[PDB]
Amino acid sequence: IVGGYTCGANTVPYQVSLNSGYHFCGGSLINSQWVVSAAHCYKSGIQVRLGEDNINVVEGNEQFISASKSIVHPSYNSNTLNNDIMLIKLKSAASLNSRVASISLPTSCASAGTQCLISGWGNTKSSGTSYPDVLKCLKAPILSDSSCKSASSAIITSNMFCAGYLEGGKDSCQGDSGGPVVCSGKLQGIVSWGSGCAQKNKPGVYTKVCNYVSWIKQTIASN
Shortest CB 173 distance to Ca ion, Å = 21
Residue 25 or residue 87: which is nearer to Ca ion going by CB? 25
Among the residue ranges 44-52, 83-91, 151-159, 191-199, the one whose residues contact Ca ion (CB under 5 A): 44-52
133 lies in the site for Ca ion, by CB under 5 A: no
What whole-number distance in Å separates Cα of residue 36 and Cα of residue 180? 9
Give the residue ranges of the annotated binding site for substrate. 171-172, 174-175, 177
Query: Which residues are catalytically annotated?
Result: 40, 84, 177
Terminal-residue alpha carbon distance, the chain: 33
Shortest CB 25 distance to Ca ion, Å = 16
Residue 61 or residue 211: which is nearer to Ca ion going by CB? 61
Residue 96: is it exposed, middle or buried by C-beta count within 10 angstroms (0-12/13-18/19+)? middle
DSSP state, residue 105: P
Please list every residue from 49 through 108 that binds Ca ion, using CB under 5 A. Answer: 52, 59
What whole-number distance in Å separates Cα of residue 46 and Cα of residue 96? 20
DSSP, collapsed to helix, strand or coil, labels residue 218 as helix
- Return phi, psi of residue 89, to 5°: -95, 135
Residue 132 or residue 141: which is nearer to Ca ion going by CB? 132
Question: What is the binding site for Ca ion (CB under 5 A)?
Answer: 52, 59
